[PDB]
Amino acid sequence: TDKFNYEELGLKVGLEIHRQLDTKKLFSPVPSELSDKVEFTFQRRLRPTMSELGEIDPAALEEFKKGRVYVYEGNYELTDLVYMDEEPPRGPDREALEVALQIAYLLNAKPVDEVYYMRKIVIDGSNVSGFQRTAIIATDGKVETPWGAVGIPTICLEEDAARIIERKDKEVIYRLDRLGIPLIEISTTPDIHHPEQAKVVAKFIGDALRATKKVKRGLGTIRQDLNVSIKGGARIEIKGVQELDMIPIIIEREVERQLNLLKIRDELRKRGVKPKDIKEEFYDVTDIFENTKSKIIARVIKKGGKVLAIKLPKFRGLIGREIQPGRRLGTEFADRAKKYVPGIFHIDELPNYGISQEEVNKVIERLNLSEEDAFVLVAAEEEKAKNALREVIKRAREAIEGVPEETRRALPDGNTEYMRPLPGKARMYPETDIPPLRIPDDLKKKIKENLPELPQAKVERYVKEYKLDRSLAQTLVDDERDELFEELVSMGVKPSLAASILVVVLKG
Amino acid sequence: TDKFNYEELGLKVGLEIHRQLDTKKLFSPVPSELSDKVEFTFQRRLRPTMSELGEIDPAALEEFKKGRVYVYEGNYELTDLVYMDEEPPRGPDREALEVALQIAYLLNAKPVDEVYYMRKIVIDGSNVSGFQRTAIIATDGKVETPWGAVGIPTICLEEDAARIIERKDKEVIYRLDRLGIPLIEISTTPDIHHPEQAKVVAKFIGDALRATKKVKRGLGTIRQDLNVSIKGGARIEIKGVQELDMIPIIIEREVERQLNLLKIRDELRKRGVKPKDIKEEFYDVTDIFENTKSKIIARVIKKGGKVLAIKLPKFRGLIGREIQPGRRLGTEFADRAKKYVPGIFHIDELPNYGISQEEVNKVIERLNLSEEDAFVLVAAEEEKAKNALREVIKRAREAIEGVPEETRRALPDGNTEYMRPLPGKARMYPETDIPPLRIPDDLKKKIKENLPELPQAKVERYVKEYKLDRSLAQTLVDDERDELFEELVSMGVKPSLAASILVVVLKG
Amino acid sequence: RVDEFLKERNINVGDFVRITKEEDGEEVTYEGYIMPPYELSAGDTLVLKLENGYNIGIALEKIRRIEVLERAKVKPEVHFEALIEGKPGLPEVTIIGTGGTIASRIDYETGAVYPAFTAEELAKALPEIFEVANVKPKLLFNIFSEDMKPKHWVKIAHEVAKALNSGDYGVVVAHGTDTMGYTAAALSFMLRNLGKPVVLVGAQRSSDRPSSDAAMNLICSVRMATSEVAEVMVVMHGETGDTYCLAHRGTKVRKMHTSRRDAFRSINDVPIAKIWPNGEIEFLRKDYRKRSDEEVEVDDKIEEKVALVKVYPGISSEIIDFLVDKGYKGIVIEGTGLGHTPNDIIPSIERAVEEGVAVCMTSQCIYGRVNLNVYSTGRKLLKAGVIPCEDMLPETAYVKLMWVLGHTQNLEEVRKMMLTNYAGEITPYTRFDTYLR
Amino acid sequence: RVDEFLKERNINVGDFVRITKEEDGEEVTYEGYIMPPYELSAGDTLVLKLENGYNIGIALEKIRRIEVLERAKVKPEVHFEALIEGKPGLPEVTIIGTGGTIASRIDYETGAVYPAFTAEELAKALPEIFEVANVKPKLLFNIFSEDMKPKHWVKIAHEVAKALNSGDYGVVVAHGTDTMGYTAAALSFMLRNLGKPVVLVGAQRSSDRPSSDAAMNLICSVRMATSEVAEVMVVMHGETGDTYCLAHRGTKVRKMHTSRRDAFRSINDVPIAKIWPNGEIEFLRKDYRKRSDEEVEVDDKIEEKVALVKVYPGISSEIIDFLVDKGYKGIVIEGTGLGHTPNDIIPSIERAVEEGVAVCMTSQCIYGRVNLNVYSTGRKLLKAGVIPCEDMLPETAYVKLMWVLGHTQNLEEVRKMMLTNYAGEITPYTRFDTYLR
């Protein structure tokens, strides 16, 4: 039973997963040990690079103008010249590589005959060399599913950036220990057409990585992202999705939000509103609030703050409409607005927050509002309120047109929240220091045969072969004891119940 | 009219003179500049050396036992490895070498044909390498004088030691800037047989030095040490003879000192007292002084000190006998005692300082003294008191023999004061790092002919050739303004009177 | 084997293609633009750039189908204005290009990296310098320092003097990292009677990577060109960080590390001064040549038939003998300790000297001062007529000898020459703060 | 000219004499003991020690009368106890004397200095050691680190292995300073499977000078022979003052200074520990071989037909043609920067590989690691089959290649071995605190 007929809507779900490998650093024989011991620190600046025809990448020029300086922390024993950009890289690390080759087969993907490394430029400063070393390792892999097969176009073995420590102004601090730890990137295809189908592919891959029993089981170590779209909607990047079980719902709260946003755009088109029909003019309604029982605004004024308004033709009864359980088109306004102000007030949410109905109508006047005209108020320091409202403008207009193609972060509720615009296309160029690596069919075969045991498969062998409880079989693996048990039984000992019962039950 | 018939008393005097050359350091192209800027420091320890047959010099060994470390101060610009003992020396510095040669001839000395450098061993720590590089450069020179010619057996060019900053116990701190400054040492012969003759040699040599016009001028830059003696007395090294004009009186006062001591020794011999008659037994008399009116002793006691006596048979009226204007035999006792104690009391000098006849007779009794026997007190902690009374006994003993050999220092009085015991013979050995230096016959001649004119020879010429008044001539020279003066005239200018007068008189 | 196989089937590098290959029986298909073969790795593999921009390798063998979809778009080709209009009041500074690229453009969709040296390109890359002085880039020759030779240190010295005497306020030479300390010492002896600043400068990290040290070094370099310092210096990072650069006197400079920006150190003397891109300067000494009106006089004279020989336990005197027989005029020996050679070799040296060869002694330990009077072996080498080169750098002594011989063959003269301080090479005495610093 | 003349008039060195000579027309009269001639110079001069101790020089021609007062009072020829009565409960450390003197007696009256290696001497001279272990002086041979060949290293290993396995708690080799680092690297590879401390030690300042660093070096070295560190190490002052010594791993030590005590440094890797004559210690690293009972196994095999060639701008390929030509099996090229060579010479190297010669690459920049993939020149040297030696000291790589060529002649095998890490020789990665230290 589904919430929507995902087949009608243009449900397209894509999936991308990053995971640290438990090998040495990808381009230097270094222990992927994190450390909180800072024994020394050094300064650095990064500069944009000219194009084929002398043009400086705007996004980078921007970062440059800011005039920020990058400070890196390292410890004498774990920090080496290679990740200080003081010695050429050496790699890819053989373990990390093989591990990758192994994860690739577990996904029916075809490895490349020869690996060429690339350099993806990085503005942040999170990459001392100014770039992250990446490389395609396998293509066209697949994950069989109930709703059909979902394909894996790419599988890459790249470098993880360093740990941010503090973002002082004009100075960002980073810890090197993390920099260089291998990263495995798996990307699905936006062909996924079902919320549970995603969880399947997502889970499976997850198991395949566990199967290598040479992956990091850390807190902030598993990155999984989703990008959702519907027919007549937009590709939205949902970053930072917590647990595998949240995928199903999150993908739906999106299909829902996008389905409602449109049901609103159709409403606007009907009322006949247009992008240009939303002049960016600010009214100084401040005075009308000189005497308001709204602590919020009142505080602003008393501190030399002004209240400004905006006129949104035919946006009445829609700004306050709920798109996601607990969130309404107005919430979307506040988010974009949050960029300059802590929040906003719109005609459809008040009277409230200590704002007298009087005050409301009194505002409808100075800006002359129709039976469908609405407004937005932002109490802040002169300019703040201007930019804030402008950002509100941008969205408002976009709302008339459709679904803004943006990048949102997931919430505990399952709904999303605005983050930033869809990331720009990355600029890469050959990683000239590392010779091209060839993968012998010789090695391809050796690895393709001895592939590890997917978690579930084990669970299903314990039951079928050792005849034990399904409850015990699961809890035996679901609790990482998958090894201890095998090691115990390996002694021809504790049949399975002796061990299983002991571990899964006794211990607890 | 002299004080004594210095011919009867076999007066023998010698002269030893050290002087720094205003050149670069003797074994490294370094400015002989001094600096109070200490930018870095390093610690060092020196160690004795075995002899051909495994022996260790008692003195140097003794110093090893004291377990003292040598700390050396130096700055980054005036301290080189050579004087840190971290690089072989190069030298001698040609300038200093020649100035040496010049001084040699200027003193009728016969320069050596080839120079070889020695390493005089040094315990102090004043020489970072453990030794002082020295060399003989000229020999058998001579200074003519009213009493006959006096010889100059040796002329040497050696390194001066580091400056002492502090001698903490178990750590002496030295400054390196002075280490390496060239030193020219000129030594007389023990034959000067008259005080005046001494001053004459002393003055001539001083002048030969001024002539070279590249001998350092300043406070601590000149060493004039004497060594007096008398028929039946002892060779006494007298350090720190401040100004040339004291040389005659010092020598005279010394002859007096020694002459008197002998008179005393004779009185003693006549009374019949042998060193063995001075038992080193200390009588405790802290009692007879339990309620004395001597502020001195009284304090010592209240702090828990004692008053030990010493019985000196037949030494009455001899301890108080004057040996030099204002100095008595007891001043010698006290002098030696000063090694452990601030002062001493003796029977000839009291009643006095708060000590009553009662206290005196009470002591004369407990020691059972005759009318010829005497005593000597010391008020201090029991041990210190003993060591002092020991030091006094050694002296009272030496007194019956005659004139103790020692090295005394000069006083503004013209008197001497015990200082330390004569230094032992120095151990020397080949400085194999510096090649022998051959002195070409052409260089000796090219130097021997262009000898500077002595200062007095100038004053005399000014009076003949230039006719200027003597007072003018001398004052120009005696106030080092002789250099400038010569400059004015070179211009065929200010005849002499104008120049002379303007300087010596006008600018004064 | 891929090169020809490719052309046959008519496939141009840069062509968008669709290839299919059999991997383990399976069938795989890619779509990308054909790329150039890795520097040196012949046959068996074809490189393709997927629309991901990612580079892939295809085993020719396994290729079953190659179809050209679109052709090689290859077009535009843009050029930049070599020199540009200076700003009022700023000094003139010429950057002689010796091959050490200080900037580059990079075709991201092609993967190529082009060296840049135009005033326009330098401005588009290093505004900072065009704010300190008016930079006139003059391309002398694009060469790797690795294979740089004396004939070049002559062409440089002249090119420098020309610009220097034309009236430039100072000169900056874009050299390579490897040889730079050799060149530095060459320009130090050849540029006789200098009055303006001459600055060698290069980048340890290529100048196309966002992290490069090219920029800051350039910036500090042009600032030094404007100094009151009249000598050849190397100006490179003083530490790992983008802190300050160090200005080393060009004859006491050595490349101590293999790849750090920290790489160039002043051996046996202090650097001239610390400088910050910022513009601030802190002199570390007072004794450096001041700027003057003096016109510079080159001095090409150099006998390049000189060899540098590092001694090690057990070297057959045959290597010295070969050099002699072959007719070398001078030999600088990278000796041992205070300047020693196995006694096992003294004889061969002794002959080369009698053969009128100039033999100089330096020392395997970069720091410190040679001195052949302390030990017996040294005294032997002295008696054999070996010229002890005080505290001169081995590489500096090599270069100083080619120059000194190009002036004379008289060994008595060669001493004086060698043992005479024309630039910073010999030091009156060794300071304590000069080691490992 | 004086040696004979003296004998002619029937004189013996040491005879107390009275010379009369002329100087600018007039007589000068001396009286001293005839001394030996300057250690390296024909003499037109005679050396005479006066009753001052001061040595003086006289020109023969000026000598008019040279009477003999007393004659050569030649005496004794004292002897000392080779070994001395040990102490209950103290380790047995044998000091293999390789020629580097750790003590000495000096005859002041004669002015001569004799080395000392006798236990009775090391006792009175340097007591400290005998309150730490029973010291057993073992004369292996008197040689100067300058002229020491591989064959000597061998004679060393055995004697160490022997004494070591013969119950000794640890061994201490008293080597000269000039080549110590080469020796150190040697034993390192030779003493296979070591379970006890091996310590090379020497003095920068001669044993006779009160300021010699000989004593403290010995103490510190013995305390280490007594340690829990199971590997070959060099122990010398860490700083310039009498403070603490540093114990470097014998495959990462180089003499970095011509005369200082700081002379020895660890390169590309951190020292093992700090030791004080006093006794305190301070490891600076945790990963060092520990004490064990395993028996040390000496591994002789070494092909010494290998040369070390330091590149430089202007080298002719002839220097390399000559080596291949005279049958050298191995060449350790200590090149430029990341490990480059002038391209005009890559062919003579290309040819040396074809003639099955082992060509290894290291860099003149003592610190850092060689990497030949970055730049084109490097890739070219790779194609020619040159073996990159990571961050291995050029001297170490020399020693190593000899040893390794003493095992194989097959290049594929020489590659693996060279690149295999038997001692600290190579490093997995470069620490930031491993340069100029």
Ligand SMILES: N[C@@H](CC(=O)O)C(=O)O
């Ligand atoms: N191989 C480079 C080395 C560098 O500059 O870092 C060169 O062209 O000299």
Ligand SMILES: N[C@@H](CC(=O)O)C(=O)O
């Ligand atoms: N020439 C000496 C130098 C020294 O050890 O200090 C040697 O035998 O190595």
